[PDB]
């Protein structure tokens, strides 16, 4: 009766074999953004609203963001510079090209660090919140990179900010269940679907307009690395998620004729910081439950309040969130891509300080995203040694 596994499985844990990131060229200094944004949307006369926005920017912890929506692009697309005029068609015209294009730039870098050849990529796992299309961005990316026609694809549209953890969770099972599989784990965001003129009737929309920026991250993921040929940077040992208690309805994202509109209905930093430790306490058990300050912390930088309140609740030393805060400062909140950048920055900090691992000297760490649900996604990683 029983048969051998027809598609052989792999043995070791899924590993991050290479990392690449990309952003649009134009930089928007947060200190100059209130004036630019309120002028380009024809709201320069709303002095009281603008002062509220400037106070968000001053406290946002963001120094700059990268955006494809330059002044030239926004003038070419006046519907995007309105509050609620129909504009989804011209928004989609931007993102269906730019989202896979940005992913392709990051993927070339990840493939270069990995060291293998692109015809050995067997899967694409792709998250975004920036529009949808048919064929999907995964198909577009496969063509941009010239991958084999048989590449297996998991396209996760409309994730929200937890999508970076989502692609790593899916890559884990695809890599581990398939001998030789090499997975492009992809997250790419371009804010042309959420960009919106400020309004006193959408004060929570001011937050998104202060925090959201563009970027893409790509990991090559695979089990059983070839000795002396492939070099694992991180091993993925655990992947899980949970809806947080009493958080239902915290975040709504309606895709409309006027693009994507977020509504914030509950205290997202408070809900995460109140509930995160009980879930993290289960997640760390299969690696021996190290203490919080014996771990590294690749946390999605959704905003300074989330980072500040999680830090305070868990009593973490200030270095733990520094990687996340570095990414918030130089890139803002890049939705699903952000946390892929954070893990890379923790690796960069480790090399610069000469730590004993790529997790700044910690053996194990968390890779954390969160989003509508409220959904909390957590992976437990092991950082490779650093000499």
């Amino acid at each position: 009766a029983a048969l051998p596994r027809a598609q052989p499985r792999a043995e070791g844990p899924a590993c991050v074999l290479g990392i690449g990131t990309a952003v649009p060229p134009a930089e928007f200094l947060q200190s100059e953004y209130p004036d630019f944004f309120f002028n380009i949307t024809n709201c320069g006369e709303k002095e009281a609203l603008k002062a509220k926005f400037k106070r968000i920017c001053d406290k946002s912890g963001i120094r700059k963001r990268h955006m494809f929506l330059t002044e030239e692009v926004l003038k070419a697309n006046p519907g995007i510079c309105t509050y609620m005029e129909p504009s989804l068609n011209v928004r989609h015209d931007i993102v269906v090209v730019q989202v896979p294009k940005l992913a392709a730039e990051a993927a070339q870098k990840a493939i270069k660090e990995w060291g293998g050849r692109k015809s050995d990529i067997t899967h694409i796992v792709f998250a975004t919140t920036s529009g949808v299309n048919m064929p999907g961005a995964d198909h577009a990316l496969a063509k941009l990179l010239g991958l084999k026609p048989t590449v297996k694809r998991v396209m996760m549209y409309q994730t929200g900010c937890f999508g970076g953890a989502s692609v790593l969770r899916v890559a884990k099972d695809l890599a581990e269940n398939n001998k030789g599989a090499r997975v492009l784990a992809v997250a790419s965001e371009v804010t042309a679907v959420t960009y919106r003129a400020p309004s006193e009737n959408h004060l929570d929309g001011l937050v998104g307009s202060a925090l959201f920026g563009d970027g893409a991250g790509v990991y090559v993921v695979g089990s059983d690395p070839k000795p002396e040929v492939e070099k694992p940077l991180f091993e993925v040992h655990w992947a899980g998620e949970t809806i947080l208690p009493e958080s239902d309805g915290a975040i709504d994202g309606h895709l409309t004729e006027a693009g994507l509109i977020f509504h914030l209905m509950k205290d997202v930093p408070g809900l995460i910081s109140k509930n995160i430790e009980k879930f993290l306490n289960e997640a760390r058990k299969p690696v021996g439950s190290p203490a919080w300050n014996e771990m590294f912390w690749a946390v999605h930088p959704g905003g300074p309040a989330i980072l500040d309140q999680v830090e305070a609740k868990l009593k973490l030393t200030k270095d733990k969130m520094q990687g996340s805060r570095d990414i918030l400062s130089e890139f803002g909140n890049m939705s699903s891509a952000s946390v892929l950048f954070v893990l890379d920055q923790i690796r960069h900090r480790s090399v610069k300080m000469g730590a004993s691992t790529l997790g700044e000297g910690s053996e194990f760490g968390f890779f954390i995203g969160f989003g509508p649900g409220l959904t909390l996604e957590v992976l437990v990683l092991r950082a490779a040694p650093n000499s």
């Binding site: 509220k52 106070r55 968000i56 406290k59 946002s60 009737n201 004060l203 929570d204 001011l206 937050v207 202060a210 925090l211 208690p245 009493e246 239902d248 309805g249 709504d252 309606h254 509504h263 914030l264 209905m265 509950k266 205290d267 997202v268 905003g303 300074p304 309040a305």
Partner: protein, 208 residues
């Protein structure tokens, strides 16, 4: 005659749709929150009740508000269980869709019922119908919702999307456990409007 709540006029004297009982505005406030420095207001709210309510809450007269509002005071349940007609007016400040409003009401009431060992198939079905009542509606800025506890076991819901004060009842909750949970949502210790509850506690305390 009128109190100004978050810039919206709330009558001091109010008979809910199809009722002959006139109710006094006992307290007023908002739902809202602060996010990355900016303050958001979701609604302005007013709690109304038969003027006799003060007689029933005699032991609280003269005390300080911090005693009433404090956890374990017993003021919350006592206020909720007072045998008079009550009403809540909600004026929408942040326009939202009917489905998310009803769905968030559903999860809020479900939590309370599960915590009290009162969430069974009957209560589950009642919340499902409550969401289905709300889901075809839009709740733009200015829209008014009236919840009316003529009995403690029912809730008459009236809704004007266009921001008038409705004259007709659009839906009735017939589940007693849901009715009490909805009152607890606004007047319990875990109220979503601590402002309205403080305002009510003040009016009760500020009497001889």
């Amino acid at each position: 005659q009128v109190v100004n709540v978050e810039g919206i006029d709330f009558a001091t004297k109010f008979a809910p749709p199809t009722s002959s009982t006139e109710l006094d505005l006992i307290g007023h406030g908002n739902t809202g929150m602060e996010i990355e420095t900016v303050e958001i207001r979701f609604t302005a709210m007013g709690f109304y009740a038969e003027p006799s309510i003060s007689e029933h809450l005699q032991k609280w007269k003269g005390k300080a508000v911090s005693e009433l509002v404090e956890d374990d005071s017993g003021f919350h349940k006592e206020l909720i269980q007072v045998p008079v007609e009550k009403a809540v007016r909600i004026s929408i400040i942040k326009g939202i869709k009917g489905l998310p409003y009803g769905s968030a009401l559903q999860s809020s009431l479900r939590d309370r019922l599960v915590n009290d060992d009162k969430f069974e198939e009957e209560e589950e079905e009642a919340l499902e119908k409550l969401v289905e009542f709300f889901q075809p509606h839009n709740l733009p800025k200015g829209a008014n919702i009236i919840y009316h506890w003529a009995t403690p076991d029912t809730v008459k819901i009236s809704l004007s999307e266009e921001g008038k004060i409705p004259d007709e009842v659009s839906y009735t909750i017939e589940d007693a456990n849901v009715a009490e949970a909805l009152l607890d949502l606004y007047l319990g210790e875990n109220t979503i409007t601590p402002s309205t509850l403080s305002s009510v506690a003040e009016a009760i305390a500020a009497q001889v």
